[PDB]
Amino acid sequence: QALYAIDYIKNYTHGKIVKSEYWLAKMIDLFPVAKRAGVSEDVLNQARELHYDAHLYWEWWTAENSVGFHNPDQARESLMTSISKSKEAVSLLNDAIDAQVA
Amino acid sequence: NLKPVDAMQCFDCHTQIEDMHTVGKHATVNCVHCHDATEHVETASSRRMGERPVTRMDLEACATCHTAQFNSFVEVRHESHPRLEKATPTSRSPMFDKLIAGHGFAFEHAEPRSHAFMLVDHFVVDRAYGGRFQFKNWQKVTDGMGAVRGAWTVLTDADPESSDQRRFLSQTATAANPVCLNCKTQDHILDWAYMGDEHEAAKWSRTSEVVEFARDLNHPLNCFMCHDPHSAGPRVVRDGLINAVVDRGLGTYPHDPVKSEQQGMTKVTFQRGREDFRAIGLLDTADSNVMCAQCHVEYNCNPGYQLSDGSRVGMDDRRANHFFWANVFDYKEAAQEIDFFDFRHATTGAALPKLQHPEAETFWGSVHERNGVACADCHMPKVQLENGKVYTSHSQRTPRDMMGQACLNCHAEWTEDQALYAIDYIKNYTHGKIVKSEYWLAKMIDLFPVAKRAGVSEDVLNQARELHYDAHLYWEWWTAENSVGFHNPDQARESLMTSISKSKEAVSLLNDAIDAQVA
Amino acid sequence: NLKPVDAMQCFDCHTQIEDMHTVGKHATVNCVHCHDATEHVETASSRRMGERPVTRMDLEACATCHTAQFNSFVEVRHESHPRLEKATPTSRSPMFDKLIAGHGFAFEHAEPRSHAFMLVDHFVVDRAYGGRFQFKNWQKVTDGMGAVRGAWTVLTDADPESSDQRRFLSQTATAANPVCLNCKTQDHILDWAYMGDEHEAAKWSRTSEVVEFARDLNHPLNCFMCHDPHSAGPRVVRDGLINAVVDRGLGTYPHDPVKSEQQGMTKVTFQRGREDFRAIGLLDTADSNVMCAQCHVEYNCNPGYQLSDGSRVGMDDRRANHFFWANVFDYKEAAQEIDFFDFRHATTGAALPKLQHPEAETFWGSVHERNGVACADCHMPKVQLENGKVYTSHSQRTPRDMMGQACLNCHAEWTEDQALYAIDYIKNYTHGKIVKSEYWLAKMIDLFPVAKRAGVSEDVLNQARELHYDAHLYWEWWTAENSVGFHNPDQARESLMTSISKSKEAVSLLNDAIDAQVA
Amino acid sequence: NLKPVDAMQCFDCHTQIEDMHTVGKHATVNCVHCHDATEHVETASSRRMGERPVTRMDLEACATCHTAQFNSFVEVRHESHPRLEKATPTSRSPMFDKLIAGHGF
Ligand code: HEC
Ligand code: HEC
Ligand code: HEC
Ligand code: HEC
Ligand code: HEC
Ligand code: HEC
Ligand code: HEC
Ligand code: HEC
Ligand code: HEC
Ligand code: HEC
Ligand code: HEC
Ligand code: HEC
Ligand code: HEC
Ligand code: HEC
Ligand SMILES: O=S([O-])[O-]
Ligand SMILES: O=S([O-])[O-]
Ligand SMILES: O=S([O-])[O-]
Ligand SMILES: O=S([O-])[O-]
Ligand SMILES: O=S([O-])[O-]
Ligand SMILES: O=S([O-])[O-]
Ligand SMILES: O=S([O-])[O-]
Ligand SMILES: [Ca+2]
Ligand SMILES: [Ca+2]
C-alpha cells in the first residue's frame, strides 16, 4: 500500500512532466518557423520571456529526484504553470506566423 | 437488528416485484434488507407513492449474505499501476497529445485500475470537473474499501458553495456530464429516467448540473448492476445497452442471430404515475459478455457535432447517451447513421470521432467468442479449492493473476509461461502497429500547418481531413481498447494497417500539394 | 428454489423459538432454510407433534449465507500430518504402549488433524469399531469436503447386515459408544435426550447399539454447535458441559467467580410430551473458551470401575457421560467424588485414570487466560484484509500458520521468529519432562513383575499401585493435552515434576522390597 | 561525555600496563573508557591501592568503538532450538537417563 501511494504520485507527476515537455517542444519548434516567416523580434522576445517561465516550471521537476513525491501539490501546480506558459507562447507564435502568411 | 416486514402487503401494489421475488432465489430474502418502507406503506395508494421508501444501494446490503463475492470484488490490485498517464513513451499511446489535440482527453487519460475506484477516479481525473474534487489527501488513493463505502468519505470538494462546472486548476477540463455516471454507479437508478430523458419523476437527467448530481452519488459498480435484487437473476440495468439490444433490435450478438436468440435480453419497464419511467434487461443466461458490455463499450456520453452541418449536439439530445453497438469496421457507418462526431482536431481541423474502451464490440467474432468463451471466463473465473464451496471470483482483473483458472484449464497443452508468451506475442505485435500508426498520423498532422502556410487549397485540405477521420478511427480504437489486440488479434492487425494506409495516402496528398505550391 | 413459510403460524405453538428468532440477527431468516414442516403444520396441535418436520443438520444450510466462514472451516491443513501414531519415538509419547497397557488407546492413538475429519476419523481409528469402518479407498483420506458433505459418502462398512461391535481385524478394539459421538457431530441433537439418559422421545441414548447410531450420523462439527440457529447468538449444545457449568453449579470459570458471572451460561430446556428432553446453554458473550470446551476437555465417555469396590460402571450409568471440569491438581478429587476410574494397568494392576485433551481446564489460570485471551484469539483470529469486510477465520489450527493475527498484533515487541522461539522454548522444556516422566514410569512398571516374582507382599504392591495412580495422572495429562505445555507452562512443569517424584518414590519402595526378599 | 585522564601518571605505578598499553593497538585508547580511578589516584601509593578504582566489565565498553563485532556476537540464532533436552529420542542421547543415573545431569 505504501509503495502504491508513492507510485500514484510519481506516475501523476511524470505524466505532467511529459506533457510539459510536449508543449515546450511544440513552442520551441515554432521559433524557426516564426523566424523564417519574418515574425518580429518584438514577438520573438515576448515568446522568449515566456520560455524562461515554461522552462523553469518544467525543469525543476526533471532535476528534482523524487518525481514529485517530496511535494506533490507543488509539483502539480508548477507543471500546470509550465504547460500554461508554453500554450501562451504557442498561441502567440502561431498567430504571428499566420499574420505573416496572410 | 432487522425486523422482517410482511411482503404480502407490498405485493398488493407491486405485482412485477411479486412475480420476480416469489419465483427466484431471493424468495426468502425479506424486503427489510434493502428497503425502509414503513411510512410509505402508511401513505401509498395503488397509484400514488405517498412517502418515498428508502432503498439501500450500498454494496454492504449484499455483503451480509455474500461476503465472499463482496471481498473478492473490493480487493485492490496493487500491480495495476495507479494514475499512470497513457500519453507517455512507456504507456499505451506515446503520441496521444499530438493526435488527440482538441479533445478533453488531452488534459489527462490514465490507465484503468481496480473497479473499487471507478467513481472516485471519475471524480478526480483532471479532464472531468476542472479539479474541483480531490482525495482528502494523497494517502487516500490506496483506500478501496473506503471508496466502496462511499466516494464522499474519501474525497473533498474545493467549493461546496457553488455547483457550476469550472476550472480550479489551469490544466484541467470540465468534460463530466450526468451520462458518465451511469458507467460508474447506479445509486441513481430510481432517480433517472430511461436514457436520461426529461421526466416528471426524475430528479436527474442528461441536462442536470453534474456537480450537484455528483454530490448525490456514492458507490461504485453496485452489485445489482448484474444481478436483479428481487429475483437474484442475471440482468443489465444500463439504459444505453438496453436501447441498442432491444429498442433498436440489434440483439445481444449483432453478428449472430442464433446466439442472440439463445442468449437474449427481455426489457422490463417500471412506471411512475402510470407513465414509463425506468427499465432493466433480464438476461436469458448469466452472460458476462452482456453484463460487462454495460460499460466496456464505445459510446457517446457527451455533446458533439453533426457531420452534416457541423451544428452542436448538446446533452439535451438523445444522441448524447448512445451505444453504437458496432465493431471497428461498422463504426463509421454507425456514426453517420446518427449524424455525429466528437471534436475538431486542433491542428488539422478534421471532424473526428472519440473512441472509448470498445472491448465488447472487439470481442465479437473473435476465436474465443466464437467458441462460447465470455469475459468472466478469463477475468472473473470460478475459484479452485482443494476443499471448499466454489464461488465465482469477483475480482475483475487480468488473467495473469490466475492463469490456472483463466487459461490453463482449457489450454491443457500449455504451461503458464507458454500461455503468457502467447499473450505477449499478440500484445507486442499489436503495440508495434499502434506505434507505427501514431508515427504516420503524426507525420500527416505536422503537414497541415506546412500545407496551410504554403497556400494549399481548402479542397486538398478537406480531402486530407476526410482521410484523417479514417486514419484516426482505425488507430484510436486500439489505444482505447484495453487488450492491446488480445481480444481480436486479426481485427487489430487489419484495422491498424488500414490506419497506416490512410495516413500514408494523406501524407502523399499533402506533400504533393505543398511541392506544387513551391514550384 | 426455497419458498418462505408463515413463521407467525409456527409461533402460535413455538413460543421459545419466537422469543429467540424475533429478537436476534436471524429474525429475517425464514424457517424453510432449515425445516420442511408442511405436513407437520397440517397435523400438529400445541399438544401433539403430528407429522415430524424435517430439520436440516448439514453445514451447507449455513454456507448459503456464510460461505466465508464455511470455507475457512472446511480447509484441510495438509501440514497437520495424518494418521500419525503418538506411541512412536518421534511423536508425543514414545513409551505410551508400556504406560497405557490395559487400555483401548494401546490399539491406536493418532495426533489430531483438521476438524473436517473428526467424525470419519472417529469411525475409522483402530480402537473404535473393531475395524468395521474404512474409507472407501486410501485416496479418500484427503477429502475434507467429502467428509463434511457426509461420513457415509466417503466410508464403507465391512458388514452392513450386522449391528454388533466386534473385531474385523485382530489388532483393533471396540471402544466406541454413543457418548463419543457428542464430540464429533450434533446431527442427533433432536434424537438424544440430555446426558443420553433413557427417554421415550429419544431414538438414541447411552445404551444404544453404537454401530446403528453411527450409521445415522453424517456431519462433523455442525455450525450450530456454537451458534443458536434461531437467535444466531453464542451457545453451547454439549450436555456434559451444561451439566458441569449449570447443573453442578461449577460456573464457566470455576477458579474465577467474577468472570463466571460476567461470562456465564443460561440453560434453555426443550420438552417432548410436556417432559424435559434436551437443553442448550446460551452464553452471555461470544466466549470461545466455553465454545471449544464442548470437546477440548477431559471427560468420561466410556464405562469404567468404582474406586471404592472395583465394580463395573456401565454405559447405563450417568457417570459414563461426565465432564470433570477440574484442573490437573483437582482431578483426583473430582474422580473420587464420582467414585470412578478407567482401567487397570496390564502389568502393575493399578487402578488408573485415562486422560483426554484437557485444553480448557489447563488454560484456566494461565497468563493468557488471566489477561482475557481466549482460544479463538490464537486459533480462530479475525482475518486481516487490506480492503475487505472482516470476518472470523473458522480454520481452527495452530497459530504458526497466522502468526501476525494470532500473536504479533498483541506482541508488538516480537518478530515472527522470536514468537516461534518462545513457543518452542516451552514445548521443548515440557516435552523433555514428559520424556523423563515416561522413563521413570517405565522403570517403576518394569519393577512390578520383578517384585511379584521375588515374593514381595501384596501390601507393598498396593502402596506402589496407589503411587502409580498419581505418577500416571501427573504425566498423562500432558501427553493428552495438545499444547505440549504452551497453554500453561508452569502448571505442566509442576505436574510433570510431581509425576517423576511419585515414580521415584515407587521405584525406591519396590527396589527396597525386592532387595529384602533376596536377603 | 568521557573526559580523558593522564595515563602517564598511572604508569608511574603500573609498569606492566605501561608496557602493554603503549606498544599495542590500544595505545590511543584512554583509561577512562574502562576505569573510573579519580579517587584511586588521589589515595594510592606504589605500595597501597588506596580507594579501589572502578573497572567496567560490560561489553558496551568495547561496542562503542567495535559495534560490528559486538552486534555479530549478540545476534540470537533462532534456529538453535532452545531448552531442548538431550535425553530424548530425537536429540543427542536417547538413553542418557539410564546411562547417567546418579549424576546431576
Ligand atoms: C399500494 C398502496 C402500495 C403498497 C402497499 C406499497 N407500495 Fe411501494 N409504491 C407504490 C406506488 C404507487 C409507487 C410509485 C411507483 C409506482 O409503481 O407507481 C411505489 C414505489 C415504491 C418504490 C420505489 C421508490 C422510489 O424511490 O422510486 C419502492 C422501493 C417501493 N415502493 C417498495 C415497497 C415495499 C418494500 C412495500 C412493502 C413494505 C411497498 N412498497 C408497499 C404503491 C405501494
Ligand atoms: C441474505 C439475507 C441475503 C441477502 C441480503 C442477499 N442475498 Fe443473494 N442470495 C441469498 C440466498 C439464500 C441465495 C440462494 C443461494 C443458493 O444457491 O440457493 C441467494 C442467491 C443469489 C444469487 C444467485 C442467484 C442464482 O443463481 O439464480 C445472486 C447473483 C445473488 N444472490 C446476489 C445478491 C445481490 C446482488 C444482493 C444485494 C443486492 C444479494 N444477493 C442479497 C441470500 C441473500
Ligand atoms: C460506460 C459506457 C462509460 C461511460 C459513459 C463513461 N465511462 Fe469512464 N470508463 C469506462 C470503462 C469501461 C473504463 C475502464 C477502461 C478504460 O479504458 O479506462 C473507464 C475509465 C475511466 C477513467 C479511468 C481511466 C482514465 O481515463 O483516467 C476515468 C477518469 C473515467 N472513465 C472518466 C469518465 C468521464 C469523465 C466520463 C463522462 C465524460 C466517463 N468516464 C464516461 C466506462 C465509461
Ligand atoms: C513518521 C516519522 C513518518 C515517516 C517516516 C513517513 N511518513 Fe508519510 N506521513 C506522515 C504524517 C504525520 C503525514 C500527514 C498525515 C496526516 O493525515 O495529516 C504523512 C503523509 C503522507 C502522505 C500524504 C501526503 C500528502 O501530500 O497528502 C503519503 C502518500 C505518505 N505520507 C507516504 C509515506 C511513505 C511512502 C513513507 C516512506 C517513504 C512515509 N510516508 C514516511 C508520517 C510519516
Ligand atoms: C457484473 C459486472 C457483475 C457485478 C457488478 C456483480 N456480479 Fe456477482 N456474478 C457475476 C457473474 C458473471 C457471476 C457468475 C454467473 C455464472 O453462473 O457463471 C456472478 C455470480 C454471483 C453469485 C453466485 C454465486 C457465485 O457464483 O459466486 C453471487 C452470490 C453474486 N455474484 C454476488 C455478487 C455481489 C454480492 C456483488 C456485489 C459485490 C456482485 N455479485 C457483483 C457478475 C457480477
Ligand atoms: C480470455 C480468452 C479472455 C476473454 C474471454 C476476455 N478477455 Fe479481456 N483480456 C484478456 C487478456 C489475455 C488481456 C491482457 C491481459 C494482460 O495482462 O496482458 C485482457 C485485457 C483486458 C483488459 C485490460 C486489463 C488490464 O490491462 O489490466 C480489460 C478491461 C478487459 N480485458 C476486458 C474484457 C471484457 C469486458 C471482456 C468480455 C467482452 C473480455 N475482456 C474478454 C483475456 C480475455
Ligand atoms: C401448533 C399447532 C404447532 C404449529 C403451528 C407448529 N408446530 Fe412445530 N411442533 C409442535 C409440537 C406440539 C411439537 C412437539 C414438540 C413439543 O414442543 O412438544 C413440535 C415439534 C417441532 C420440531 C421438532 C421436531 C423434532 O424432530 O423433534 C420442529 C423443528 C418444529 N416443530 C418446527 C415447526 C415449524 C418450522 C413450524 C411452522 C412452519 C411449526 N413447527 C408449526 C406444535 C406446532
Ligand atoms: C441467509 C438466508 C442466512 C442463513 C441460511 C443463515 N444465516 Fe446467519 N446470518 C444472516 C444474516 C443476514 C445475519 C446478520 C448479519 C449482520 O451482521 O447483520 C446473520 C448472522 C449470523 C451470526 C452473527 C450473529 C451475531 O453476531 O449476533 C452467526 C453466528 C450466524 N449468522 C450463524 C449462522 C449459522 C450457524 C447458520 C446455519 C445454521 C446460519 N447463520 C444461517 C443470514 C443467514
Ligand atoms: C469430547 C469431550 C470428546 C469425546 C466424548 C470423545 N472425543 Fe475423540 N476427540 C476429541 C478432541 C477434542 C480430539 C482432538 C484432540 C486430540 O487430543 O486428539 C479428539 C480426537 C479423536 C481422534 C483423533 C486422534 C486419535 O486419537 O486418533 C479419534 C480417532 C477420536 N477422538 C475417537 C474417539 C472415540 C472412539 C471416542 C469415544 C470412545 C471419543 N473420541 C470421544 C473430543 C472427544
Ligand atoms: C497412472 C498410471 C497412475 C500413477 C502414475 C499413479 N497412480 Fe495412484 N492410482 C491409480 C489408479 C488407476 C488407482 C486405483 C483407482 C481406483 O479408484 O480404483 C490408484 C490408486 C491410488 C491410491 C489408493 C490406493 C488404495 O490402496 O486404495 C493412492 C493413495 C494413490 N493412488 C496415490 C498415488 C501417488 C502418491 C502416486 C505417485 C507416487 C500415484 N498414485 C501414481 C493411477 C495411478
Ligand atoms: C465453535 C467451535 C464454533 C463453530 C462450530 C462455528 N463457529 Fe462461527 N464463530 C465462532 C466464534 C468464536 C466467532 C466469533 C465470535 C466473536 O464475535 O468473536 C464466530 C463467528 C461467526 C460469524 C459472525 C461473523 C464473523 O465474525 O465471521 C458467522 C456468520 C459464523 N461464525 C458462522 C459459522 C458457520 C457458517 C459455521 C459452520 C461452518 C460456524 N460458524 C461454526 C465459533 C464457532
Ligand atoms: C494463544 C495465547 C493461545 C490460546 C489463547 C490458546 N492456545 Fe491452543 N495453542 C497455542 C500454541 C502456541 C500451540 C502450539 C502450536 C504449535 O504449532 O506448536 C497451541 C496448541 C493447541 C492444540 C494442538 C494444535 C496442533 O498441534 O496442531 C489444540 C487442540 C489447542 N491449542 C486448543 C486450544 C483450545 C481449545 C484453547 C482454548 C481453551 C486454546 N488452545 C487456547 C496457543 C493458544
Ligand atoms: C601509584 C601512586 C599508583 C597510581 C598513580 C595509580 N595506581 Fe592503580 N593501583 C595501585 C596499586 C598499589 C594497586 C593495587 C594493586 C597492585 O598493583 O598492588 C592499584 C590497583 C589498580 C587497579 C586494580 C583494582 C582492582 O580492582 O584490583 C586498576 C584498574 C588501577 N589500579 C588503575 C589505575 C589507573 C587507570 C590509574 C591512572 C588514572 C592508576 N591506577 C594510578 C597504584 C597506583
Ligand atoms: C575506541 C575509543 C576503542 C575502545 C573503547 C576499544 N577499542 Fe579496540 N581498537 C581501537 C582502535 C582504534 C584499534 C586499532 C584499529 C586498527 O586496525 O588500527 C583497536 C583494535 C582492537 C583489536 C585489534 C588488535 C590487533 O589486531 O592487534 C581488538 C581485538 C580490539 N580492539 C578489541 C577491543 C576490546 C575487546 C575492547 C573492549 C575491552 C576494545 N577493543 C575497546 C579502538 C577502541
Ligand atoms: O411491481 S412494480 O412494477 O411496482
Ligand atoms: O471516459 S471513460 O469512457 O474512459
Ligand atoms: O418454542 S419451543 O420451545 O417450542
Ligand atoms: O397452550 S397449550 O396448552 O395449548
Ligand atoms: O478419544 S478422544 O477423546 O480423543
Ligand atoms: O602494571 S601492573 O602490573 O600494575
Ligand atoms: O617501586 S615501589 O617499591 O615504590
Ligand atoms: Ca465515443
Ligand atoms: Ca477421561
Coordinates of C-alpha atoms in Angstrom, one line a residue, chain A residues 1 4-5 7-9 11-12 14-16 18-19 22-23 26 30 33 72-73 76 80-81 83-84 87 94 97-98 101, chain B residues 76-78 80-85 87-88 97-98 106-108 113 117 124 126 134-135 138 141-142 169-172 453:
Chain A
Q1 CA 0.0 0.0 0.0
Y4 CA 1.2 2.1 -4.3
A5 CA 0.9 5.6 -2.7
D7 CA 3.7 5.3 -7.4
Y8 CA 0.4 7.2 -7.6
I9 CA 2.4 10.4 -7.0
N11 CA 3.0 8.4 -12.1
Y12 CA 0.9 11.5 -11.9
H14 CA 5.7 12.1 -14.5
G15 CA 2.6 12.4 -16.8
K16 CA 2.7 16.1 -16.2
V18 CA 5.9 14.5 -20.2
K19 CA 3.0 16.9 -21.1
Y22 CA 5.4 18.1 -25.3
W23 CA 4.2 21.7 -25.0
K26 CA 5.9 22.4 -29.7
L30 CA 7.7 27.2 -33.8
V33 CA 9.1 28.7 -38.4
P72 CA 3.2 16.5 -4.9
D73 CA 0.9 19.6 -4.8
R76 CA 1.4 19.7 -9.8
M80 CA 0.5 23.1 -14.8
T81 CA 2.1 26.6 -14.9
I83 CA 2.1 24.0 -19.7
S84 CA 0.1 27.2 -19.4
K87 CA 0.5 27.2 -24.5
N94 CA 1.1 30.7 -34.3
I97 CA 3.2 33.3 -38.2
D98 CA -0.4 33.2 -39.6
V101 CA 1.3 34.4 -44.2
Chain B
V76 CA -7.3 -3.7 -4.8
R77 CA -4.8 -5.0 -7.3
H78 CA -1.7 -3.0 -6.4
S80 CA -2.5 -2.2 -11.6
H81 CA -0.4 0.9 -11.6
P82 CA -2.4 3.9 -10.5
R83 CA -2.8 7.4 -12.1
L84 CA -0.5 6.3 -14.9
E85 CA -0.9 8.7 -17.9
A87 CA 0.3 9.9 -23.3
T88 CA 3.8 8.8 -22.3
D97 CA -1.2 14.5 -27.2
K98 CA -0.5 15.4 -30.8
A106 CA -5.5 15.7 -23.7
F107 CA -5.8 17.0 -20.1
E108 CA -5.5 13.5 -18.6
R113 CA -7.2 0.4 -12.2
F117 CA -12.0 3.1 -7.5
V124 CA -10.7 13.3 -9.6
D126 CA -8.1 16.3 -14.5
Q134 CA -9.6 15.6 -4.8
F135 CA -8.9 12.8 -2.4
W138 CA -2.6 11.7 -1.2
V141 CA -5.6 6.8 -3.1
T142 CA -5.0 3.4 -1.6
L169 CA -6.5 24.5 -11.7
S170 CA -5.3 25.7 -15.1
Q171 CA -4.7 22.4 -16.9
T172 CA -8.0 20.7 -16.3
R453 CA 1.1 28.3 -44.8

